[PDB]
Every structure is written in C-alpha cells, then in structure tokens.
Amino acid sequence: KKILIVDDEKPISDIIKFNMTKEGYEVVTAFNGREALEQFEAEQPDIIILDLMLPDGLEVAKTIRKTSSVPILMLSAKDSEFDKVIGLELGADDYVTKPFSNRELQARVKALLRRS
C-alpha cells in the first residue's frame, strides 16, 4: 500500500516515513499544501496522513474530497474539540494528536485501510 505523508516538519515526516516503511508501506512525502495536492493526483495514494498546519490541511482535505474518497488521517498538535470536529467535518476519517504513539498511528492507518 502507498501512504502520502503531508507534513511540514522534516523531523516528524522522517519519523512517520521510517515507521511506515518498516511496516512495508510505500511512502511519498509532501511538505506543503501545493505538494500534497500534486502528490495526491500523480501518486494516487491509498491513504494520506495530513497535518492541519502547512505552509492549510483543512483546505487540502476539502479539495481532495471534491474528487476522491481516499482515507485521510489528520495529525495535529491542536487537540481541542473544535479542532477535531472541524477536521472530521471537513473530511478527515480520523484525527490523531501530536505527540502520538508510533504503534497507535500504525494501528489507525491499518484500521482506515481495512475499511476502504
């Protein structure tokens, strides 16, 4: 399976990339909203891990949902009700906060792919 990690912090992007590669996923990366959209169209990932804050995540997920039902897992340091709810309502299938557990992230990615 192919995962697109949309994350503007190269340290976090590398941790997720390393862990998904170890699990046997193919990884493509993007570091802003424009790159996320280009990678999305060109690579057709099976799942996207999308941070909410990008050079926004809300906007990327909105435009994606115009054409695609690809599962989106939103990742963010923002952990209030309002953040989670508006990520889910704007199309996220799931919303995990940072810092996260590597094993939980993996379990939640598999649960998204299982249902999809």
Added chain:
Amino acid sequence: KKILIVDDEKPISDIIKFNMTKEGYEVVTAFNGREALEQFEAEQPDIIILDLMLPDGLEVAKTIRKTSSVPILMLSAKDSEFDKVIGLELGADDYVTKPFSNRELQARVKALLRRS
C-alpha cells in the same frame, strides 16, 4: 425576493427581519441549525443570512452546499481572519461582523442577489 434569517438571538433576528421587510423582502426565520435546514428545503429562499453560532452555522452552510448554490451571507461577532476565511471556504459568499450597519447589510444582500 425571500430571505431566510438563521439567528439564535430573537432581538437580532427581529432587527434584520424589520429592516428586510421595510425593503420589500419576504422573510422566514429560523433559530437553530435544524430549523434552518427545514426552512431552507421547504421555503427555498433566494438568500440566507446565517449566523455562525447556533443551538453550527458552519455545518448548516456545508450541508446546504451539498445541494444548492443559494447565496449565503455569514453574520458573526467573531471577526478574526480565521473566522472569515473558514466561513468563506465552507461556502459563505460573504461574511459580515456584528455589530453591523443596517444599510451595509442591505447593500450586501442586494449585491449577492444581483450576482445570482
């Protein structure tokens, strides 16, 4: 023309109703998100003035846009960039803050109907 005013404060709802009636609009009212949706479907207004905070406005406008291009003018006490931008991106044609000028509200309603 028919205006649906979705506002959960009966004092503000009455000020807008009074002013739109004086301008020759037919007015229907709704005081929460559920009533807004019911009035929308049953009354088919030409325009909707939608407050953002309801017993949300963001959710109402989202679901409306699933089926309809009816012009939406968002009205709110929240006046930050983030509020305006996410109201517009979630489908509002316009975003006016409270307190507002009665004459400006009227001018902006007419400008929405002119283009539509």
